[PDB]
Design a protein around this nucleic acid. Structure first.
Ligand SMILES: Nc1ncnc2c1ncn2[C@@H]1O[C@H](COP(=O)(O)OP(=O)(O)OP(=O)(O)O)[C@@H](O)[C@H]1O
Lengths: 370, 743
RNA sequence: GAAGCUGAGGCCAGUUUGACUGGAGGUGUUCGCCAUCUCCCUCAGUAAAAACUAG
DNA sequence: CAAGACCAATCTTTACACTCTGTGAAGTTTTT
DNA sequence: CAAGACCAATCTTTACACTCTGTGAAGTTTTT
DNA sequence: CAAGACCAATCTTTACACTCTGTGAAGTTTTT
RNA sequence: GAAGCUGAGGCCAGUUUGACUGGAGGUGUUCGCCAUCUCCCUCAGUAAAAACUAG
């Protein structure tokens, strides 16, 4: 039974109180104004952040909780989904012998809003929420989408960091996930996707993934709804590939099993932090030099205790970083225990690093009481 | 081993399911409609497509996926050892080498090959079948010889015991043909014919002529290998048709026939798989259907006897014991007897798999802990404990009174959902070695205890003291040892005050029967809120205290009135003259207590008396009711004292967690104890046999209360709300269990 | 036209009479900074979703 | 630069009339 | 006087030779 | 210029040995 | 580099003071000589396979 939303569904469990005034006075639900959205710059990328006090944030959150979480997705989408994780994206490819990796350029900016409307239409009943002026689907997309002030030409845009944007991206790209999965299956290729990074693997002894034909076919498919392939990040290798530090290897031939292991570049930062901890480097220097976390003087809440405040903050930040990396490798260990696909010697190295991390966190906590 | 893993993606009821770490016996348990046989169908289709049979592809779980994948990881370490060695130069060995392990050792170099040879050999063969949306099937290995050889080496034997043809056991022979491997080049059809003709002829040559005639007339196809071995078996043995204990099959039963069929087949499997390198995977559905519990237990016992008779270890060795790996035996059962005997007789060689279909519809496979380190628990393991594996929600309790309460038929009538939860009283050691927290996700549970197990207040010292269970619980709850910040600051604060409670002191009143300002209700609520993460619920007082609260005083009193009116009779075969004599000797007003002692006594049987006798008895009973009402409301200052006295008489605890026996031993509250003893020995003597915990007063109380309140109120929602108001403690636990069951 | 790229500066080293480029080595390699072994500072600004808290 | 291949769900598919028959004139990591 | 109907179990029923084909030249009650 | 996808048929695939168990020390038209 | 193209000449017309290009029109059209209606000569050289001899 698919999820259906009617007028009562929006008015009772979705809106609750965010748009009570609009529904009692029959006033049109307004666009997300620029006053509610702040524009952050990170790299060349631009992020859009909504203010929490606005009712749009709350209705986005309850939309995410109750509506977008029930629409079926494609199993090739491993990101932003309940139970999906990067290791799951990198696992089906342990069976492959040749690997290829593609990227979609500006995935979130290139999502057409009309495609979002078409994708969400079957799951929302066609009614008139506000008299005969605004339809229910129109109000919901008014809640979900946004108009970019920097680029007014392209009109309504699903922005980065709008709470509901990832789930909507998965839903609107389910069509292409199905198309590309069908094509790869007919070619005998294992396909998976994380956000916009696509990974293909051939378990047979063939050069299909290294050919220009495969790129051309994937691009031809992606042009159906207007996406493009980032040519700078295209990668194709044999018997071993490294994706953001996680190395998948398969030296075997017929019926062989590969292994996934993080490399030393990935563990460089944690190894350096443990080395600095063993060298009795002060905590402030460790936090600033490696963890790029610093206590700006404008962030200090009170002037009553400041010398103690800085030390406690840096102690807590080091504890939090060590615990975070401890849980990141525990995730690796759990994934290996569930699937048995991580390198055994790398499992030994993980165990050693985890014991070192635990001992260092114990030492820091013991020093906290001194 | 035989099979390393089996993975199903988007086929039938499975979304993404991986089964691994197989043991010699794999018991599959789970509710109806969870996919237990869907595993059978998936494996059967995979093996049918392995031999290039023409079958319909299986249906996709959801149509939003363009693929459906089945992955099998065969374990070819032993076959690699078999074939790689230089001694085995046979033609079957040469074929296995040239098909499987060639082109795989080809890619490796000398260093890696030598490393594989010298070190602990571990070789796997992964085969993936992908069904596209247009019913096409694509393999990950494009050599059909490889797939046929894999089917031959690791045959799949499959039985649904429900649809067994009882009166014809022919399908046994076929399966036997799948098991054993040997040579047939030397045996032609000429030497055998000459041998038979020489043995069967009054004149030499006749039988050969007969066989030549039959061969010339007919037109046939050369034998396959399995037909060859079947024919040689059937000629060699004394008889073909099967007989159960000297009696023909059609005269015997159905359960006996199925039991004997399964027993002989499994015995043949284990006996014949000893000498060969062919490692079958056998799947039995319902090994228990139509079997008496004793027969199912005996079936598993005989299976284990055969399994252990051929098993070789460091201590057991000699003639007749083999190191050859046993076939992977899966069987899906719904019988606690099969599972109980499997666990008790196999130990570490068995695995229990739980199949549950979640909320969306996908199947989940989990491993339930079935290995115990305690020999005493293994020996004492019985049907009651093994029943827990089939539970949906286990409510562990401490004493038999909770069992009496939570199993009440009338109480379960108004809460049907809680009828699906099995209540099992668990000692601390039993609860420790069961390990219910290991499953949790598979079988949700809750452990119900009294707050006395945590804190032991001392009246003399006016101090709380922490039991070691509290320290152990705090130790698991101080998660922050190696963690990062989260919204757990409230938890850290609560643990800080839980440690602080030791140093604090609280005064008591009425010689240690109440708290001046401390609210044990607040402490219980905080403890339960904190410890919900550990699935433990602590009640403020004992279960008797939970039943008998200040709010439950009226109905309980009504019960006393009813227990005053109906269930006693006259202690004499002559009610008229006896009642007259006791009315004469004992006054109505001044000596009502001895008069009621002499006249009325508790009796299940109620003889019918004369109308005047009924009138006299009714007047006496009403007078005694009024006298007890006045005496109870006079001797006790407030309702709370009466409730505490009732709790203590039945065996409960005070606010300070003290029983009547504990108070008597410590000597405190002499006045209250004397009042209770006076009420028990003088006015409430008839209730004295019902004062004990095991006397069953809980059942009668709950039955009467439910019947009375249903008489007062008709609607079921109204009756449930009245139950919640009148017993705020028990109804809360039932509601929580039902809510957890629904999800 | 289409494609792609990175926060703002300050000493020190290398290329420049006056400003621009990097701040472990070894080994192998598909040459990708890709893999494996051993051993610079400051100041801004830092949205969202999911996985993960060994046993 | 530009293009074939653009999810899977979603709603009475069984006769009419003049014509008895014819239909029409405060964590890590990843995407980023 | 004399008479039809006189349990159900209990044991290799599959070919031979000369003839390649033919078979042969110290309780009650019941029976009592 | 250069490249994934390079027919379908065609041959005993069932055990070995020391080890009773372990695997090893003179027409038209089309292509043209 | 890869791709593609057609037998050798002689008057006459069109482009050229002196040699090169075509030898029914109408209509429509994907503009392909593609479709539909109506009504230049000479001389060489010309392998193979299949279909087809209305009814
Ligand atoms: N073709 C199919 N497509 C989708 N789901 C299917 C299909 N066939 C069966 N199912 C699902 O799989 C389950 C079928 O029950 P199944 O026999 O697999 O379970 P089971 O535990 O063996 O049952 P039982 O306990 O009665 O033996 C149901 O949940 C059903 O919805």
């Amino acid at each position: 039974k698919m999820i259906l939303v009617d007028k009562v569904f929006y008015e009772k469990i979705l809106s609750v109180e965010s748009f009570k005034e609009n529904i009692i006075t029959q006033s049109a639900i307004p666009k997300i104004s620029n006053k509610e959205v702040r524009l952050i710059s990170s790299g060349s990328k631009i992020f859009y952040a909504i203010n929490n006090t606005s009712p749009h944030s709350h209705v986005q959150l309850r939309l995410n909780r109750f509506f977008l979480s029930h629409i079926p997705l494609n199993s090739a989408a491993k990101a932003f989904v309940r139970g999906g994780s990067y290791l799951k994206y990198l696992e089906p490819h342990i069976y492959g012998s040749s690997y290829c990796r593609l990227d979609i350029s500006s995935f979130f900016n290139n999502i057409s809003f009309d495609d979002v409307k078409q994708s969400l239409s079957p799951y929302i009943k066609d009614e008139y929420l506000i008299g005969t002026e605004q339809k229910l689907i129109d109000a919901i997309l008014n809640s979900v989408g946004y108009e970019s002030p920097i680029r007014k030409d392209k009109g309504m845009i699903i922005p980065m960091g709008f709470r509901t944007s990832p789930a909507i991206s998965n839903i609107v790209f389910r069509k292409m996930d199905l198309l590309i999965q069908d094509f790869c299956a007919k070619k005998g290729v294992i396909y998976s996707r994380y956000a916009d990074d696509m990974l293909f693997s051939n378990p047979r002894e063939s050069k299909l993934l290294m050919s220009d034909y495969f790129i051309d076919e994937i691009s031809s498919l992606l042009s159906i709804m207007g996406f493009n392939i980032n040519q700078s990040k295209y990668i194709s290798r044999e018997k071993e590939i490294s994706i953001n530090g996680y190395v998948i290897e398969n030296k075997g031939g017929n019926g062989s099993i590969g292994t996934i292991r993080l490399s030393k570049s990935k563990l460089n930062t944690v190894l350096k932090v443990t080395h600095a901890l063993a060298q009795n480097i002060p905590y402030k220097n460790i936090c600033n030099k490696y963890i790029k976390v610093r206590l700006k003087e404008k962030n200090i809440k009170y002037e009553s205790k400041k010398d103690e405040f800085e030390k406690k903050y840096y102690r807590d930040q080091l504890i939090n970083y060590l615990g975070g990396y401890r849980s990141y490798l525990i995730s690796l260990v759990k994934f290996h225990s569930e699937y048995k696909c991580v390198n055994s010697d790398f499992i030994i190295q993980i165990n050693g690093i985890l014991n070192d991390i635990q001992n260092h966190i114990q030492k820091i906590k013991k020093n906290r009481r001194l | 081993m035989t099979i390393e893993s089996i993975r199903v993606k988007n086929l039938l009821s499975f979304d993404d399911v991986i089964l691994r770490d197989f043991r010699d016996i794999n018991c599959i348990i789970g509710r109806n409609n969870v996919g237990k046989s869907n595993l059978l169908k998936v494996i059967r289709y995979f093996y049918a497509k392995l031999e290039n049979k023409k079958v319909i592809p299986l249906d996709f779980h959801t149509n939003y996926n363009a693929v459906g994948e089945i992955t099998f990881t065969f374990d070819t370490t032993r076959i690699k050892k078999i074939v790689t060695s230089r001694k085995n130069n046979g033609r079957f060995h040469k074929h296995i080498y040239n098909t499987l392990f060639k082109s795989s050792s080809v890619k490796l170099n000398f260093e890696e090959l030598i490393a594989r040879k010298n070190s602990t050999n571990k070789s796997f063969f992964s085969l993936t079948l992908t069904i596209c949306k247009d019913d096409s099937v694509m393999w990950s290995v494009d050599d059909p010889k490889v797939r046929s050889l894999l089917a031959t080496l690791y045959p799949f034997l499959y039985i649904e015991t429900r649809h067994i043809d009882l009166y014809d056991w022919n399908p046994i022979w076929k399966l036997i043909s799948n098991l054993n491997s040997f040579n047939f080049d030397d045996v032609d059809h000429d030497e055998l014919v000459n041998f038979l003709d020489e043995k069967i002829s009054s004149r030499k040559g006749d039988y050969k002529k007969y066989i030549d005639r039959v061969v010339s007339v007919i037109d046939t196809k050369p034998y396959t290998y399995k037909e060859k071995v079947i024919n040689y078996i059937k000629v060699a043995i004394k008889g073909d048709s099967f007989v159960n204990a000297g009696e023909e099959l059609f005269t015997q039963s159905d359960g006996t026939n199925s039991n004997k069929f399964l027993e002989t087949l499994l015995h043949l499997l284990i006996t014949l798989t000893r000498t060969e390198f062919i490692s079958p995977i056998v799947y039995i559905d319902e090994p228990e259907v139509g079997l008496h519990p004793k027969l199912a237990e005996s079936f598993v016992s005989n299976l284990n006897k055969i399994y252990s008779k051929f098993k070789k270890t460091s201590e057991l060795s000699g003639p007749g014991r083999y190191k050859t790996p046993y076939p992977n035996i899966f069987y899906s059962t719904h019988s606690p007897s099969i599972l109980k005997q499997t666990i008790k007789l196999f130990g570490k060689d068995q695995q229990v798999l739980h199949f549950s279909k979640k909320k969306d519809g996908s199947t989940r496979v989990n491993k339930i802990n079935s290995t115990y380190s305690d020999e005493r628990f293994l020996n004492i393991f019985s049907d009651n404990e093994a029943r827990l594996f089939f539970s949906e929600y286990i409510v562990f309790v401490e004493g038999a009174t909770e069992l009496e309460l939570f199993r009440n038929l009338s109480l379960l009538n108004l809460y049907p959902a809680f009828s699906l939860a099995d209540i099992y009283d668990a000692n601390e050691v039993i609860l420790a070695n069961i390990n219910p927290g290991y499953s949790k996700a598979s079988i949700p549970f809750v452990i119900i205890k009294d707050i006395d197990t945590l804190i032991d207040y001392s009246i003399k010292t006016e101090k709380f003291s922490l039991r070691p269970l509290f320290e152990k619980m705090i130790k698991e709850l101080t998660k922050e040892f190696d963690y990062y910040d989260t919204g757990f600051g409230r938890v850290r604060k609560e643990i800080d005050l839980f440690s602080d409670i030791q140093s604090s002191t609280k005064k008591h009143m009425d010689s240690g029967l109440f708290f001046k300002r401390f609210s044990l209700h607040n402490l219980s609520s905080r403890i339960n809120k904190v410890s919900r993460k550990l699935n433990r619920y602590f009640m403020t007082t004992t279960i008797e205290g939970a039943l008998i609260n200040e709010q439950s005083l009226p109905y309980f009193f009504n019960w006393i009135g009813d227990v005053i009116l109906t269930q006693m009779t006259i202690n004499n075969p002559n009610p008229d003259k006896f009642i007259e004599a006791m009315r004469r000797r004992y006054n109505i007003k001044s000596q009502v207590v001895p008069l009621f002692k002499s006249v009325f006594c508790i009796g299940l049987n109620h003889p019918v008396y004369s109308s005047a006798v009924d009138k006299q008895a009714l007047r006496i009973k009403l007078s005694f009711l009024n006298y007890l009402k006045r005496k109870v409301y006079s001797d006790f200052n407030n309702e709370k004292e009466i409730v505490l006295a009732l709790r203590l008489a039945f065996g409960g605890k005070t606010e300070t967690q003290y029983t009547l026996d504990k108070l008597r031993k410590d000597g405190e509250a002499e006045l209250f104890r004397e009042k209770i003893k006076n009420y028990k020995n003088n006015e409430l003597f008839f209730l004295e046999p019902q004062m004990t915990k095991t006397s069953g007063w809980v059942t009668t109380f709950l039955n009467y209360t439910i019947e009375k309140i249903t008489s007062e109120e008709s609607d079921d929602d109204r009756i449930r709300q009245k139950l919640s108001f009148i017993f705020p403690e028990i109804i809360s636990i039932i509601e929580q269990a039902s809510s957890s069951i629904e999800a």
